[PDB]
Design a protein around this ligand. Structure first.
Ligand SMILES: *[C@@H]1O[C@H](CO[C@@H]2O[C@@H](C)[C@@H](O)[C@@H](O)[C@@H]2O)[C@@H](O)[C@H](O)[C@H]1NC(C)=O
Ligand SMILES: *[C@@H]1O[C@H](CO[C@@H]2O[C@@H](C)[C@@H](O)[C@@H](O)[C@@H]2O)[C@@H](O)[C@H](O)[C@H]1NC(C)=O
Ligand SMILES: *[C@@H]1O[C@H](CO[C@@H]2O[C@@H](C)[C@@H](O)[C@@H](O)[C@@H]2O)[C@@H](O)[C@H](O)[C@H]1NC(C)=O
Ligand SMILES: *[C@@H]1O[C@H](CO[C@@H]2O[C@@H](C)[C@@H](O)[C@@H](O)[C@@H]2O)[C@@H](O)[C@H](O)[C@H]1NC(C)=O
Lengths: 221, 221, 221, 221
C-alpha cells in the first residue's frame, strides 16, 4: 500500500499473508479469511507457484517476525472461477486451508457481500496489505491500510476501481489478493494497477466480489 | 456541450461568442468577458483565423440570430503567453475588444481567481458553450451548460480536467475557449478533448486560468 | 504536412484545395480530382462549413496566390457514405463540381484502386497537402509532399495507417481530405491524427479508399 | 515468448536462467552471459528476491531438467546503474557469478554494443526466453525464440521497443532480463510489457543496452 498507514495491530483480523513454505515473511500476496478453513484471494497470486509451496500465515501484523498470534496453514485445495489472465477477469481464488484456523482474538472472519450487491462511486472503503510501500522501496514489515474511494472512471463494470485524488497513494505489489473493506464488508480483492503503483493517473482495480457470492457459497458447500 | 442543458437566457452574461466577421452566427469558439474591453479565450481558437476577421459577440443566448441583447466587437489586439501547440500548453489568449462593452443585464464581467489558486479534485463546476451537442447533429443555437467535476485522473497539473461520471457528457467542438465556472469564478478555459467528445474514458482538458492571473491583470492594466 | 518537402509544381495535378468562397487562399482541406466533375475528400472537411461557401481550387501550387493554372469550382453536390464522426469511420465525401474541370498538365484525374484492394504493410506511398508544416510556421503556401509507409501498428483495418519511422514527419491540419497515393493510385484520404501532428508516437490515419470503390464509381454514374 | 518458436538446443549459448537456489527449474528471469563471470539481466528481476537465493543456470535448453550441459552459479555480487522503478528506467543489472563459467560448446558469451550505438526502427532482432508462452499455457520448458522488429512507435528513446506486426506475439512473463539479439549483438534486455503479453497494441519494451556500455566495461574490469 503506497501512502497508506500502519493499521492497528490485529485491527483487521481477517487479513492473510500468502508466503512460501519454509521461508518465513516471504509474503507475496494478501488474502482474506472468509471461513475458518477458506482464504479468499486473487487467482493471479497462485500462478507462477505450485500449491504445495504455499503457506497461508494468519493473525500477523509484522509478517517478517515470529508473532505469537501467527497461525500457519498449507493448501489443501484451491478453486477458480474462469480466471481470464489476458483480460484480467475473474481474478478470484478460494484457498482451502490444510486445517481450520483457530478463530481467536487476532484471527477472525469477515462478511461477504450480497450477490450482485452494488458499490457505488464515492463509497469510502479501506484497502490494506503488506505490499510495497513505494515501487522503489523494500517491502512493508507491518500491515498498512488506506482509505480509498470507489470510482467509476477508467473502469470496467467487472471491477471495482478506487482512487486517492488528494495524494500519491494506492495499492502496490504485494497487495494482490488483499481485501477492499467497505462498511465492514469485503467488496473487492486487489487485482491490478495500471503501469505502476500510485501513478495518480489511474484508479487501482479490484475484483468485484459480489459477482461471485453464489459461487463462493456453493464452493464452501 | 454534450449531455448538457440549455442555460437560462442571459444567466451567463460573460459568455462571449467568437464569430467570423461578416458571417452572422459563425460561432467557432467561446470566450469570456473579464474586463469591459477584454475577452479571455484559448490561443488555439485563433490559430487558423486572422485577427481582423474575428467578430466577438457578447449578449447572446441564441447565436444563430441577431438578438437585441447582443453587442459585437472587432479585435483590437490579442495577447498570448508562451502557447505551445504541440504540447498544448498555455492555451490562453486575451482579446482586447475594439471598444468597451456596455455592461447591462446580458453583458457582464466575471471574476478571475487569484494567481496560483488551487482547484481540487471533486470541485463542482459549470461548463457551457455553443459547441456541438454531440457528433450526431449540429452545434448549439442556444447556450448549453453542463455541471462538471474537476478530476485529476489521467490528467496533468498544467491543466484542469473535468469529467462527468455517470453519462455521455462533456465539452465538444465549438466549446473551445469558453469558461469553466467554479463558484462563480472562471477557473478554466475549454482547451482540449482526447480522441473525441464525451469519450467517457478521458476527461476534458481546460487551461488552468489561476496560473496566468498576474499576467492577465498586468495586461489589463 | 510536417517534415515533408515542396512538391515540384503541378507534379500532382489531381491535388484539390478546398476553400471558403470569396475568401481566396482560405485553404482548409485537401481534395483529389478523380474525375472531371468529382473531387474525393474527407466528410469532416465539410461538417461545419456550408456547401455554398466552399470553393474547390484546382491547378494550384501556391494556394495563397492567384495562379493562371488554377480553376475554381463551386459545390454542386456532395455525397456521403454513412460518416460516423464519433468513431471516425467512413471519412469520405464526394464533391460534384458545378461544372467539369478542364483537364490539363496542371489538372488531371487519378485512378482509383479496385474494391477491397489491399494495401499491405511496408507499402510506400506519398502523402501531400498544404496543411500546417508543424503548428509552428503558418500553413504551407506551396504543395508539400512526404514519403510515408503503410503500417499495421496502432491501427484499424478500417483505416490505413502510415508512419514515418525516421524523422518527425506526418500529416497536419489542413492536410485532411488530401490523397495518400501508392503506385500512382489513390489508396487513402487524410482522415486524422492522434494528439497532434508528427507525434513520432502514433501512425497517421487515412480512409481506406478501396473500401468504397463501387459506391464511388456508381456515384460517378 | 508468445507466438515464438523453440530455439535449437544450445544455439543461443549466452542464455542464462535465473532460478531460485534449491528449487530446481524455478526459472523467474533470463540473463545473458557477457563475460565468463558476468551475466546481464534486468534490475527488476532481483527486486522481489534477495541475491543469496538466486541460482544462475548456464548451458540450458530445457530448464526444468537436470541437463548435462548446465552449469549452476551463485550470486557473488550485483551492480546497478541508477535503476528507476517508478519510471522503469535503467532496468539493467550486472551479476558477478561466484565462479567463471567454463566456456564450452553450450556455454558462450555474446558481444556488447558500442556505447550510444543506435538500433533503428525496422532493425530485425531475436528475442528469446523461457517465459510464459501463452496466458493459460505455462512458462516455457525449453528456450523459445521470436524474431521481432525494432519500433519507435509508442516508445521512448530510453528504451528499444519491438513489435511483431501481424501476429499475436511478443515477450511475456519470465522473459524479463533476457537479451534482445540484433546482428549477433545484445541490444536490449526485456524490461516491460504494457497491460499484458502480445496485446498486439503495445510494443514490448527492452532496456537499451548501448546506453550502459561504458558502465558495464568499467564494472567488469
Ligand atoms: C477511513 O476509513 C475508516 C474506516 O473505514 C470504515 O471502516 C472500514 C473497515 C470500511 O468498512 C469503510 O467502508 C468505513 O468507512 C473510517 O473510520 C474513516 O472515517 C476513514 N478516514 C478518513 C479520514 O477518510
Ligand atoms: C450544477 O451547478 C449549479 C451551478 O453551479 C454553481 O454555480 C456555478 C456557476 C459554479 O460557480 C459552480 O461551481 C456551482 O456549483 C448548481 O446550482 C447545482 O448544484 C449543480 N447541479 C447538480 C444537480 O449537480
Ligand atoms: C519517395 O517516393 C518517390 C515517389 O514515390 C513513388 O511515387 C509516388 C507518386 C508514389 O506512387 C509512391 O508510392 C512511390 O513509392 C520515389 O521516387 C523516391 O525515390 C522516394 N524517396 C525516398 C527517399 O523514399
Ligand atoms: C529471425 O532471425 C534469425 C536470426 O536472426 C539473425 O541473427 C540473430 C542472431 C540476430 O542477430 C538478428 O539480428 C539476425 O537477423 C534469422 O535466420 C531469420 O531469417 C529471421 N527471420 C526473418 C523474418 O527474417
Amino acid at each position: 500500500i503506497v501512502g497508506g498507514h500502519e493499521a492497528q495491530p490485529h485491527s483487521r483480523p481477517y487479513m492473510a499473508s500468502l508466503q512460501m513454505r519454509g521461508n518465513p515473511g516471504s509474503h507475496f500476496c494478501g488474502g482474506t479469511l472468509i471461513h475458518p478453513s477458506f482464504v479468499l484471494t486473487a487467482a493471479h497470486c497462485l500462478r507462477d507457484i505450485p500449491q504445495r509451496l504455499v503457506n497461508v500465515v494468519l493473525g500477523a501484523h509484522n509478517v517478517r517476525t515470529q508473532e505469537p498470534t501467527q497461525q500457519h496453514f498449507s493448501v489443501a485445495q484451491v478453486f477458480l472461477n474462469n480466471y481470464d489472465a489476458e483480460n484480467k477477469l475473474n481474478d478470484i481464488l478460494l484457498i482451502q486451508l490444510s486445517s481450520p484456523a483457530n478463530l481467536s482474538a487476532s484471527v477472525a472472519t469477515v462478511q461477504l457481500p450480497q450477490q450482485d450487491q452494488p458499490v457505488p462511486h464515492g463509497t469510502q472503503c479501506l484497502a490494506m496489505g503488506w505490499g510495497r510501500v513505494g515501487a522503489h522501496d523494500p517491502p512493508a514489515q507491518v500491515l498498512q491500510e488506506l482509505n480509498v474511494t470507489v470510482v467509476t472512471f477508467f473502469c470496467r463494470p467487472h471491477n471495482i476501481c478506487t482512487f486517492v485524488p488528494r495524494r500519491k497513494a494506492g495499492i502496490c505489489f504485494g497487495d494482490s489478493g488483499g481485501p477492499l473493506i467497505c462498511d465492514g464488508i469485503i467488496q473487492g480483492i486487489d487485482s491490478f494497477v495500471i503501469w505502476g503503483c500510485a501513478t495518480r493517473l489511474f484508479p487501482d482495480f479490484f475484483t468485484r466480489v459480489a459477482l461471485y457470492v453464489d459461487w463462493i457459497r456453493s464452493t464452501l458447500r
